[PDB]
Amino acid sequence: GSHMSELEKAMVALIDVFHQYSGREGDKHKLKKSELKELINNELSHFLEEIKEQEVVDKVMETLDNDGDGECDFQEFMAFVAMVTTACHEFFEH
Amino acid sequence: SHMSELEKAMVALIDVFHQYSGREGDKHKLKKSELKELINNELSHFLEEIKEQEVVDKVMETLDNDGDGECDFQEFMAFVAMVTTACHEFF
């Protein structure tokens, strides 16, 4: 339709939450481990178990980082979102 | 303690898929028929309208990685990723 769809506003929300947290410390367009932790704990508190160990956040960033610079840009973040969402789908029809 | 915008975003991706994948044939996958309407009805501000069969052939081809002629949810999330990334650069 002519209105922004639910899908299109969902996409915008993915963009907004990223900039909401990447803009906090250091590079405003990437998430340092500091910023990643806050995002997950405040905005994903129903899908993923809370992170309280530094060891946990270390291992996750390593797995998310495919270009190997130790931080999560938006492109890498979409992969993460894709990954998390798929898992939730599987756990609704099983 | 109340579901985030992010968490409601992820759910919405699931809902829009099922809204369209449940229509014809496999209710858990999108045939080209269903994919076209989804794009045309729900992505009419991000993607150019599809009216050519040639277009839908090509989109499904790029989207279909398991070679079944349909778009399952996993393949669809990749699509969302692709579109979303593009929208970021122009913002």
Partner: peptide, 19 residues
């Protein structure tokens, strides 16, 4: 406004997915 399979195909190779 607006994208196309132009730009869509343009971001299929910059990243596959470490799914």
């Amino acid at each position: 406004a607006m994208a196309a399979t132009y730009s869509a195909l343009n971001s299929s190779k910059p990243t596959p997915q470490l799914k």
